[PDB]
Design a protein around this ligand. Structure first.
Ligand SMILES: CCC/C=C/C=C/C/C=C/CCCCCCCCCC(=O)SCCNC(=O)CCNC(=O)[C@H](O)C(C)(C)COP(=O)(O)OP(=O)(O)OC[C@H]1O[C@@H](n2cnc3c(N)ncnc32)[C@H](O)[C@@H]1OP(=O)(O)O
Ligand SMILES: CCC(=O)SCCNC(=O)CCNC(=O)[C@H](O)C(C)(C)COP(=O)(O)OP(=O)(O)OC[C@H]1O[C@@H](n2cnc3c(N)ncnc32)[C@H](O)[C@@H]1OP(=O)(O)O
Ligand SMILES: Nc1ncnc2c1ncn2[C@@H]1O[C@H](COP(=O)(O)OP(=O)(O)OP(=O)(O)O)[C@@H](O)[C@H]1O
Ligand SMILES: *C(=O)CCCC[C@@H]1SC[C@@H]2NC(=O)N[C@@H]21
Ligand SMILES: *C(=O)CCCC[C@@H]1SC[C@@H]2NC(=O)N[C@@H]21
Ligand SMILES: [Mg+2]
Lengths: 135, 405, 344, 592, 70, 129, 18
């Protein structure tokens, strides 16, 4: 609520992990982050790969279990493939949830530029007496 | 020329009549988007479907469905081979007691009710409609989090939904029914709405599942202990009502709405009442005279403050809120001469009526809801002070007691 | 001063409007022109400087009384509510809509057959009928509340949106927004009328003004698509993307970037051998596939570009329910400022 | 061979009737339906149903290939044609026989011979039937017609040798009319029937229509099951029918019963059939027609004579001899009332519409044969008849009394019907009679009946007071049950709500273009006034036309409506072709 | 005459029963009486309690219209 | 509740009915809803017509004896050999194969007086007037 | 005015009924 209410300039720098509901909380774009940048080490995903594999490959793991295979090594291989495919900044950059994937040294420059431009933000909420934040 | 048995014939799709029949076939398919066996299994579990829940809450025949024919567009992990109509949430508008509401209802039979991109867009659409129209939004929540085969797109839709809940906060009444297991991202939207009604023993809310809890902490816990309606009433103070069943939950929602205006600037729903003339003393009733003997002679003796509440309110009717939580304070709605009022009252029968952390936060947010929606408040006061104890200090009686102030 | 007003009503053969008369035209420029050719009532109604032509002053007065009967006295107040609550159930007239649209896609039909049935009664009060006759701009009532109706007329020029149709719609939309009338869009159009004459006549800016007006308007916007919604016709005739509030389509709706024949034509621009039998076979098969899979309601419905596909008989009562929901619409967020600019 | 599965090549009430007869006989039944009939009762009642496709008769029930394909696919071994469509198409009867199916009907030759009017006249003369004075052969010229009319006097009817549906005749009252009438007759008989042949006979001024039901087997036995009187006709099509024929001498009645048998034997006829006659004001009988099909009216004969005539058709088509050896004695009296979807308040014009309610009468003496039910829809594509009400009693008086009851009970809502006419005529002295004669005749409905039926408006609010919402409540006062309609704004006593702020009541405008003071705008589009089928196009593109010129004929409810040029100009965009289905408001052409 | 009248759609009451019916219905009919006017009093109206951004379009379409509408 | 009631029609059928669609049957009165009368030229024909009419007869929302009638009209004990039949006044409770499957606001009153008469006027309890 | 089977029937009442 606090982040979504806020109308000052909101800049996000993702430095590794941003998963799930915590991704939504920590200054996601659709919560109104004005500038979102990610370092090359950013990992933006629904959940960690060991959890995700359980559900996205549960059928294959069950078939391998019926075949009596080394399903532990199968899980390791599927998890490595999930990490290599999805657990990175680029899927969010493809969706435009990340505005730029930057070398970490660029962070201060992107922040300074955004903050200089957003001194006045012409944004508004619907008229209300006050909100009703959870208490 | 060719003549088909009636079982395989379809009216020629090139004619207007054939296009009408095609729309009928598609509409029929939307009534059971994952096949009839799933509906049969819902009824076998004693639940209603998302559609039946909408049609039970709303006034008969008032529902207009939107995006009935939506289908997801994901191609990850073979999702494209299963594209159920409506994408697992039913959305639209209608009336409750003749006043217009916007509504959505999540369908646990479609991917466990997990939120995909199109599912999220549908919810966002009815949120935006409610906000622009200044009409209450009712969400019926029942879903296993983000639809994991869809990527971070589901997180982007969650963020859009939360941002809409925050925009609407204090603008239109927002009511969340929990009618199944709401997991992960599904829990925050209820928390941002104004009222939460959970169904006893058949609905749950939790961020993290019991199995992850077991892995990280070693704690064994059932999903019912972790997130049940009783837990969210009595412990965490998140549920405003625990219904004994789905119809009881709908009745509570209709009662809530009857006290609320449609938006933060409309006039409240005043009931017509016959007001007797004369002075207060001329107008005293026998039930009023019963208050003169309510207070025990000894100051050490409690009494039930509901004896005051039900005598000052019309028809003795009082809709209590968070009845099972922080029972040392009582809050709820009633009417005085047809005017909706919010009651806040100390309850001598629990902790001598002391204020504590939980009672303070219960009354604080109740008062702020009433003041958002222009409902006047009546305080019935019998408070000896704050509940003493180091646990109260360490958990923040100063900071959290300041919220009621 | 008259051209500033909202409604110009001229008496035939009696009312004329022109800057310079025939004499001065002849003497300065040598060209000769009659009062009728220069500025007769019917000519000015076709040019769109006049909104109505009538045969007598009594008829003009009655047209004024009817016109005012749909409107508030001012920007702030409320219009009359006339015959609320008639016919709360599905009528035979509603059921007549299920077969009103011709089977063949080439067939023109009169849009008034629909407009006379989807509102509270036959009181569809048309304004500027002679201007841009491929477009209807009318007042009607829904549950007794007045609304502005913008509808394509397939009977005339296939319902294509020409220059005068574009500026008629634009000015009617701005007027209706100014006096808080909800807007109902009834769509059956191939989009903008192509050709050198329309381009030189200004079709780009006039369409731009139609787009500008429809997005500017704060009033409730509801759309019903009947058959065609191609290209800019789809976009401008109250699409959801241009901020329409509720969007319905009949099962005969066809929503696409271009019609089947235009898609087939560019298909055949490549490997062009249009005399051969085989390319005519290829065109026929392409058009068949396109009208089955592309130019339909169903892609827009599955993407949620439209809110519902409806049986035609539902339309009247569904319009009532929708505009009841939208009655208190607040349009925002908008930044208050001196004014919006428009292509001009 | 023997019938085992009957395909009912028809729709509506007659299809239901034959399906029911097949179930009684223990035969399997196959329905066929056009797309408009996909939900019809007969489609749901038959043991099987096959979709012919197509929207109109010309592309469904009239298509031999489709009906024979449905029979092949269903494995039906017999076809019953009902009435209309192909029931009297001799080439269809032959095609059915060539397919090896049992044709439940008369021989193709009998159909062809009795369908040719002048061959039928020769057969009747050979049978020594009573004939009206008339020409034995087609007349060749208006001068020959004038010579005939000079011999026999006036009026004279000139009639098409193949015509039907009441269009087969014109009448000349004065000699000078003959050339124009003959021109019109030969023209329109060529146009409608493809044959120009015309013949001339004495026109009877106020005749009754009387007809004999025949049952004839393939072994040459014939039984006259009874007579009907069908004199209550509109546009020469029947509306009310009764059995036995009342107010006939025994000499007349026996002459009918005997001439019908002679005629059938000369025709070689077998099956059910009917011999139609006219009875003059002088009481002279005159042969009129043989119908080579089951009659629409057959159930009043069934009720009075105790014979199931459709099952008799099955027996005859099985080739069994008649088990009835002698003409039944009628018991009681029966009326049939055709429940046509026609508004008697607008000259019995038919209109399509939804059957939002249908409550048949029940109880003593009532039989209902209906092709529709609550929720049915009547499209513009087929005949207007919804149902038939048959009322039977011990006497003509008791049948009239029961008819007044049953017609008071009969409720139909959502489209116009002739029920208000039936309610009148069963109470009209001209049709009650004096106990020995009655005044009705084949032109009485148009030229004598005091038409007081108010035009149908359904539920439409028309006056200002109609727009006000209403509530209906049951009040009991002293025990009396009253139904009381209360306006939603009743300002009685302290009541109010006469206007919420700004509410105005005014007369609602009809859902029609413009004011009624003018026909049309100056616009160039000729637009279809109704749903229908374009049956004829009378113009071509580039033709110049003048106001009033015929542009197309649209058939709806099997009636022709001419659509005509509203202005002079050039036909500039002819968009329709014959056989095209068309919707109201469709642009047919632009006149420029 | 274009008032919507009471209609007895079924039954034929005797005049005594018509009088009893109408007297009872007229006693039941009550409430509004004559069309009194609720006097306009905009003090403390809800729209005045809302926060509006300085550039909020709702200042025109909600606040101003609510004050001006008559 | 009689949620649906579709009497048979057509040749030889008479329906005498005390109920229609939407009627409610309570326990206060005898169970008879209606009488279906079927007539034919012969006993055999009347049976054939009865098998038709009873196959058409649709009643829904409560149990009825229609399945019993559908059996007995096809039962050799009732069709008979053509000169006798085997039914008797105990043939249903015994001897018949019972293969039928089991089925699966107050008004306001105002006491007016008018001249010499009391008249109770009874109104629906929610008359909005 | 009351309509009874299509008859008009004036009924006159006091102006002060509840
Ligand atoms: C929320 C924010 C809101 C913001 C909104 C903002 C608001 C909106 C903005 C606000 C809107 C701004 C509005 C600005 C106002 C416009 C400014 C006006 C200036 C002019 O625009 S100023 C033109 C100067 N002017 C001509 O052009 C003559 C036309 N141009 C020609 O070229 C004419 O053709 C010409 C010149 C040849 C003749 O002039 P004619 O007037 O056109 O007509 P004619 O001569 O043919 O008539 C018949 C003639 O016969 C004569 N005559 C008459 N009676 C008798 C008699 N009894 N006996 C004898 N002789 C007689 C007499 O001469 C008469 O003449 P007349 O008609 O009486 O003058
Ligand atoms: C931010 C949100 C996140 O990060 S997701 C948080 C954890 N993800 C979850 O799925 C929560 C736990 N989900 C589940 O396993 C169940 O749905 C829960 C909620 C425990 C309830 O179990 P229940 O529905 O009774 O039995 P079940 O799990 O066998 O049935 C689930 C059916 O739906 C599916 N499903 C479930 N969750 C998801 C999901 N998140 N994404 C995609 N699909 C999901 C399952 O595959 C199963 O479908 P099916 O029966 O196999 O055809
Ligand atoms: N000579 C006549 N005088 C008076 N009326 C006549 C005469 N011939 C025919 N009619 C009228 O025509 C009606 C029907 O005529 P007719 O039976 O010849 O045609 P139809 O029923 O159309 O024939 P079809 O079986 O070929 O369709 C008769 O009921 C009678 O009203
Ligand atoms: C005797 O008076 C002391 C015991 C009572 C102390 C009570 S407890 C609850 C109230 N809160 C507080 O701080 N003192 C009061
Ligand atoms: C057409 O829709 C089906 C047959 C019904 C019309 C036919 S025409 C000849 C018969 N005579 C009559 O009145 N109806 C029957
Ligand atoms: Mg005939």
């Amino acid at each position: 609520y606090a982040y979504g209410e806020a109308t000052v300039a909101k800049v996000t720098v993702i430095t590794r992990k941003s998963y799930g509901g915590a991704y939504c909380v920590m200054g996601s774009k659709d919560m109104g982050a004005d500038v979102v940048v990610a370092w090359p080490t950013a990992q933006i995903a629904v959940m960690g790969a060991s959890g995700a594999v359980g559900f996205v490959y549960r059928q294959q793991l069950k078939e391998a279990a019926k075949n009596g295979e080394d399903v532990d090594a199968l899980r390791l291989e599927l998890q490595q493939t999930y990490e290599d495919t999805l657990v990175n900044p680029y899927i969010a950059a493809e969706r435009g949830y990340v505005d730029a994937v930057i070398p970490p040294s660029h962070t201060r420059g992107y922040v300074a530029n955004a903050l200089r431009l957003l001194e006045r933000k012409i944004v508004q909420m619907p008229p209300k007496k006050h909100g009703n934040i959870p208490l | 020329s060719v003549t088909e048995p009636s079982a395989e014939h379809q009216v020629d799709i090139h004619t207007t009549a054939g296009k009408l029949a095609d729309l009928k076939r598609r509409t029929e398919e939307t009534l059971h988007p994952v096949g009839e066996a799933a509906v049969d299994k819902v009824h076998a579990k004693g639940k209603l479907t998302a559609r039946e829940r909408i049609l039970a809450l709303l006034d008969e025949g008032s529902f207009v469905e939107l995006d009935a024919l939506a289908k997801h567009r994901s191609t990850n992990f073979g999702l494209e081979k299963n594209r159920p109509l409506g994408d697992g949430v039913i959305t639209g508008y209608g009336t409750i007691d003749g006043r217009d509401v916007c509504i959505f209802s999540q369908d646990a039979t479609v991917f466990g009710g997990s939120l995909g991109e199109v599912y999220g867009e549908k919810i966002v659409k009815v949120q935006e409609l409610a906000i622009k129209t200044g009409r209450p939004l009712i969400g019926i929540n029942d879903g296993a989090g983000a639809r994991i085969q869809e990527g971070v797109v589901s997180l982007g839709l969650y963020s859009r939904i939360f941002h809409n809940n925050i925009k609407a906060s204090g603008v239109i009444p927002q009511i969340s029914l929990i009618m199944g297991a709401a997991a992960g991202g599904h829990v925050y939207s209820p928390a941002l709405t104004d009222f939460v009604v959970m169904v006893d023993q058949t609905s749950q809310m939790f961020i993290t599942g019991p199995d992850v809890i077991k892995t990280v902490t070693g704690e064994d816990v059932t999903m019912e202990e972790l997130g049940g309606a009783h837990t969210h009433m009595a412990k965490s103070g998140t549920a405003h009502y625990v219904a004994s069943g789905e119809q009881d939950a709908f009745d509570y929602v209709r009662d809530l709405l009857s006290y609320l205006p449609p938006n933060n600037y409309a006039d409240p729903p005043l009931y017509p009442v016959a007001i007797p003339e004369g002075s207060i003393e001329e107008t005293l009733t026998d039930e009023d005279l019963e208050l003169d003997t309510l207070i025990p002679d000894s100051p050490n003796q409690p009494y039930d403050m509901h004896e005051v509440i039900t005598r000052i309110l019309d028809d003795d009717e009082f809709l209590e809120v968070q009845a099972g939580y922080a029972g040392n304070i009582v809050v709820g709605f009633g009417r005085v001469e047809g005017r909706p009022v919010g009651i806040v009252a100390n309850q001598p029968t629990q902790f001598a009526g002391c204020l504590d952390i939980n009672a303070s936060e219960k009354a604080a947010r109740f008062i702020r809801t009433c003041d958002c929606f222009n409902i006047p408040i009546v305080l019935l006061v019998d408070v000896p002070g704050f509940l003493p104890g180091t646990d109260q200090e360490y958990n923040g009686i100063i900071r959290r007691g300041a919220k009621l102030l | 001063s008259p051209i500033q007003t909202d409604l110009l009503v001229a008496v035939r053969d009696q009312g004329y409007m022109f800057i310079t008369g025939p004499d001065v035209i002849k003497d300065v420029t040598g060209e000769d022109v009659t009062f009728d050719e220069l500025g007769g009532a019917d000519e000015q109604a076709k040019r769109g400087n006049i909104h109505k032509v009538v045969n007598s002053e009594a008829e003009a007065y009655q047209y004024v009384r009817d016109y005012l009967s749909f409107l508030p006295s001012n920007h702030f107040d409320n219009p009359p509510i006339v015959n609320p609550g008639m016919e709360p159930e599905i009528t035979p007239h509603d059921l007549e809509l299920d077969s009103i649209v011709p089977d063949a896609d080439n067939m023109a039909y009169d849009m008034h057959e629909i407009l006379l049935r989807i509102f509270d009664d036959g009181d569809v009060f048309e304004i500027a009928e002679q201007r841009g006759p491929a477009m209807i701009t009318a007042f009607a009532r829904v549950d007794g509340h007045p609304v502005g109706v913008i509808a394509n007329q397939p009977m005339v020029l296939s319902g294509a949106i020409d220059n005068e149709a574009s500026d008629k719609a634009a000015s009617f939309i701005r007027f209706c927004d100014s006096y808080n009338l909800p807007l109902v869009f009834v769509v059956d159009t191939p989009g903008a009328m192509p050709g050198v004459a329309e381009e030189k006549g200004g079709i780009i800016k006039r369409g731009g003004r139609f787009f500008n007006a429809i997005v500017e308007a704060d009033v409730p916007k509801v759309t019903v698509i009947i058959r065609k919604a191609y290209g800019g016709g789809y976009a401008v005739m109250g699409s959801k993307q241009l901020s329409a509030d509720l969007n319905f389509a009949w099962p005969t709706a066809r929503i696409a970037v271009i019609g089947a024949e235009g898609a087939a034509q560019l298909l055949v621009k490549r490997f062009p051998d249009p005399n051969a039998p085989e390319v005519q076979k290829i065109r026929d098969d392409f058009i068949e596939g396109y009208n089955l899979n592309m130019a339909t309601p169903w892609i827009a419905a599955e993407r949620g570009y439209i809110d519902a596909v409806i049986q035609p008989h539902e339309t009247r009562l569904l319009l009532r329910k929708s505009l009841r929901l939208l009655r208190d619409k607040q349009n925002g967020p908008k930044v208050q400022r001196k004014h919006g600019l428009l292509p001009l | 061979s023997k019938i085992s599965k009957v395909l009912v090549a028809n729709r509506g009430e007659i299809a239901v009737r034959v399906i029911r007869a097949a179930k009684d006989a223990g035969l399997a039944s196959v329905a066929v339906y056009a797309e408009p009939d996909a939900d019809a009762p007969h489609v749901r009642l038959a043991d099987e149903a096959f979709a012919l496709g197509g929207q109109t008769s010309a592309e469904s029930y009239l298509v031999f290939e489709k009906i024979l394909d449905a029979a092949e696919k269903s494995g039906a071994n017999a076809i019953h044609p009902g009435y209309g469509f192909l029931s009297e198409n001799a080439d269809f009867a032959q095609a059915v026989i060539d397919a090896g199916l049992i044709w439940i009907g008369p021989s193709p030759q009998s159909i062809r011979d009795l369908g040719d009017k002048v061959t039928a006249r020769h057969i009747a003369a050979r049978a020594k039937a009573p004939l009206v004075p008339g020409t034995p052969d087609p007349v060749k010229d208006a001068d020959e017609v004038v010579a005939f009319a000079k011999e026999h006097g006036v009026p004279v009817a000139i009639k098409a040798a193949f015509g039907g549906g009441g269009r087969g005749m014109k009448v000349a009252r004065t000699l000078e009319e003959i050339p124009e009438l003959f021109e019109s007759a030969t023209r329109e008989a060529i146009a409608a029937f493809g044959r120009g042949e015309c013949f001339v006979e004495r026109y009877l001024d106020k005749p009754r229509h009387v007809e004999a039901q025949v049952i004839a087997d393939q072994h040459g036995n014939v039984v006259v099951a009874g007579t009907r009187d069908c004199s209550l006709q509109r546009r020469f099509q029947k509306l009310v029918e009764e059995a036995p024929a009342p107010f006939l001498t025994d000499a007349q009645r026996k002459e009918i019963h005997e001439s019908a048998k002679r005629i059938c034997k000369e025709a070689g006829y077998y099956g059910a059939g009917t011999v139609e006659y006219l009875v003059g004001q002088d009481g002279l009988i005159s042969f009129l027609e043989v119908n080579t099909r089951l009659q629409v009216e057959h159930p009043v004969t069934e009720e009075t004579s105790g014979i199931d005539l459709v099952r008799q058709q099955f027996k005859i088509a099985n080739g069994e001899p008649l088990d009835i050896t002698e003409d039944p004695t009628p018991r009681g009296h029966s009326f049939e009332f055709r429940i046509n979807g026609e508004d008697a308040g607008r000259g019995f014009l038919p209109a399509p519409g939804p059957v939002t309610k249908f409550v048949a009468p029940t109880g003593p003496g009532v039989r209902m044969d209906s092709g529709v039910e609550t929720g049915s829809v009547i499209g513009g594509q087929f005949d207007s008849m919804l149902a038939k009400l048959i009322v039977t009693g011990a006497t003509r008086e008791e049948a009239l009394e029961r008819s007044r009851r049953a017609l008071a009970e009969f409720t139909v809502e959502g489209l116009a019907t002739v029920i208000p006419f039936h309610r009148a005529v069963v109470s009209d002295p001209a049709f009650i009679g004096d106990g020995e004669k009655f005044d009705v005749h084949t032109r009485w409905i148009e030229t004598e009946w005091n038409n007081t039926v108010e035009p149908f408006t359904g539920g439409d609010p028309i006056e200002e007071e109609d727009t006000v919402p209403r509530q209906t409540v049951v009040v009991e006062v002293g025990g009396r049950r009253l139904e009381v309609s209360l306006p939603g704004d009743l300002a009685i006593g302290g009541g109010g709500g006469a206007a919420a702020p700004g509410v105005v009541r005014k007369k609602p405008k009809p859902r029609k273009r413009g004011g009624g003071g003018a026909k049309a705008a100056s616009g160039d589009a000729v637009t279809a006034p109704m749903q229908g089928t374009v049956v004829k196009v009378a113009v071509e593109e580039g033709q110049e036309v003048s106001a009033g010129d015929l542009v197309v004929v649209l058939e709806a409810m099997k009636m022709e409506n001419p659509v005509t040029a509203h202005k002079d100009g050039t036909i500039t965009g002819l968009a329709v072709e014959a056989g095209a289905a068309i919707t109201q408001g469709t642009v047919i052409a632009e006149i420029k | 005459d274009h008032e919507a009248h009471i209609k007895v759609l079924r039954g034929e009451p005797t005049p005594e029963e018509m009088a009893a019916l109408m007297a009872v219905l007229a006693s039941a009919g009550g409430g509004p009486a004559e069309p009194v006017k609720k006097e306009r009093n905009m003090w403390g109206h809800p729209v005045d309690k809302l926060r509006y951004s300085v550039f909020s379009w709702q200042r025109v379409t909600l606040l101003e219209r609510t004050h001006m509408r008559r």
